[PDB]
């Protein structure tokens, strides 16, 4: 009647985008694998209402002005959850509800802080997007229960400090978004001995003293892996530029070129 049901391949995909829905519509097919609920009027939402659909593996709740996501029940085969562009002031725990979650997108919300062990139970998680929030600090051992993580997005936040063991355990990490923050230094032994193909570290007021020596050492060896994220209109470009990582000391001087004067 209102929602569209299509049969592509074996799975079934339902599109209920932009229909002024205040809640989950009745008489929905239980053999649904993908559910689209983009851009609606969802004040609050519970995952327990999606339990009868045991075929669901992907969910989109983006731009629904969601204030509170109640995590009741369990979704054994859910792998993708999109909660971007909402009004979430706190990050709900998806560990004991979404065990097979591989992709999580909670970007452009209002996360002021993250609780201890907010990702405990997400062993199959590979990507985490927290871009466009208000994260100032990070809890110790945040990405510990997620060893298979590949992409981490902490861009456009208000981060001033970073945990030294944030990337610990990550052997599949290939993308690191840390631009547009308030970072001034990089912790000693932060990147380790792992090869990181992509690293966005520009737009940060890096304080170039004796503490930033390790950072320069990493930038000189991984200059080919430093990229820049610039967007005009809807066109998004990614270009390698190690000279983007500049010192806060206003000479617009690249960090990797800063001479260690007076530091042992």
């Amino acid at each position: 009647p209102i929602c569209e049901v299509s049969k592509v391949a074996s799975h079934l995909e339902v599109n209920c985008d932009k229909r002024r829905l205040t809640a989950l519509p009745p008489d929905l097919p239980k053999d649904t694998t993908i559910l689209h609920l983009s851009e609606n009027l969802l004040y609050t939402f519970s995952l327990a209402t999606l339990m009868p659909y045991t075929r669901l593996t992907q969910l989109n709740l983006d731009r629904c002005e969601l204030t509170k996501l109640q995590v009741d029940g369990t979704l054994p085969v859910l792998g993708t959850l999109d909660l971007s562009h909402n009004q979430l002031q706190s990050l709900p725990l998806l560990g004991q509800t979404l065990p097979a979650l591989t992709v999580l997108d909670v970007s452009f919300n209002r996360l002021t802080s993250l609780p201890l062990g907010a990702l405990r139970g997400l062993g199959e998680l590979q990507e985490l997007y927290l871009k466009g929030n208000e994260l100032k600090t990070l809890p110790p051992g945040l990405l510990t229960p997620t060893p298979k993580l590949e992409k981490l997005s902490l861009a456009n936040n208000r981060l001033t400090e970073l945990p030294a063991g944030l990337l610990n355990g990550l052997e599949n990490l290939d993308t690191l978004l840390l631009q547009e923050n308030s970072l001034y230094t990089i912790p000693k032994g932060f990147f380790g001995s792992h090869l990181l193909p992509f690293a966005f570290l520009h737009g940060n007021p890096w304080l170039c003293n004796c503490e930033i020596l390790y950072f320069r050492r990493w930038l000189q060896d991984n200059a080919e892996n430093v990229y820049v994220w610039k967007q005009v209109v809807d066109v998004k470009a990614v270009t390698s530029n190690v000279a983007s990582v500049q010192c806060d000391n206003s000479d617009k001087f690249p960090v990797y070129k800063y001479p260690g004067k007076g530091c042992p």
Binding site: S6, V8, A9, S10, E13, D17, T102, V103, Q126, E127, E150, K151, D174, T175, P197, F198, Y227, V228, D234, V235, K236, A237, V238, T239, S240
Partner: protein, 199 residues
């Protein structure tokens, strides 16, 4: 829409050369080629998804595979791609972007995955370090890479590297952008042949 490519399932990605090897007028023909290319393809989320990326020293993404826009909207953006004409068109940077940023996960295993690389230049050897690894990496992700050479300045070495690793990776070597208008009916005969059909 094509008679052979309506029931096909495919995720196509356009990688447009933005070097100075092709002039702003020659680049406009390349854009006209892409637009006419999409007019004969059934552009939809269920059928064929498109991705337009103009690359030179880096990669500018105009259209993504997860974009929810009408085929008419996707054609205007493709026809309004700003001419860069940079000194260097890195093919290693655009494939590194294609492997990690575009083809990070297998969202559609029921559909074929083709990266249409439009090349007409040759990047410096200082950037061609991990080219082979990026090509074989896409093969492991099961991605058919199709090199499209335009003119005598096309990177012939990088063409042979892709064609020798996988049997499905066939290349297109053209003398000019005006030959794109001639081969447009032939490339689709190979693009859609590699894509599965819908019951």
């Amino acid at each position: 829409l094509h008679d052979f490519c309506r029931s096909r399932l495919l995720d196509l990605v356009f990688l447009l050369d933005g070097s100075s090897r092709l002039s702003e007028a020659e680049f406009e023909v390349l854009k006209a080629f892409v637009v006419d290319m999409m007019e004969r393809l059934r552009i939809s989320q269920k059928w064929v998804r498109v991705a337009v990326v103009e690359y030179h020293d880096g990669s500018h993404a105009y259209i993504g595979l997860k974009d929810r826009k009408r085929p008419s909207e996707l054609r205007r953006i493709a026809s309004q791609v700003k001419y860069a004409g940079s000194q260097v068109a890195s093919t290693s940077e655009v494939l590194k972007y294609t492997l990690f940023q575009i083809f990070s996960k297998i969202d559609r295993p029921e559909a074929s995955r083709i990266a249409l690389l439009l090349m007409a230049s040759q990047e410096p050897q200082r950037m061609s370090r991990n080219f082979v690894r990026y090509v074989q990496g896409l093969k492991k992700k099961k991605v058919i890479v199709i090199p499209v050479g335009i003119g005598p300045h096309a990177n012939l070495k990088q063409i042979r590297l892709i064609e020798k690793q996988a049997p499905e990776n066939k290349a297109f070597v053209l003398s000019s952008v005006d030959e794109l208008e001639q081969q447009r009916d032939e490339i689709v005969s190979y693009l859609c042949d590699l894509a599965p059909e819908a019951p």
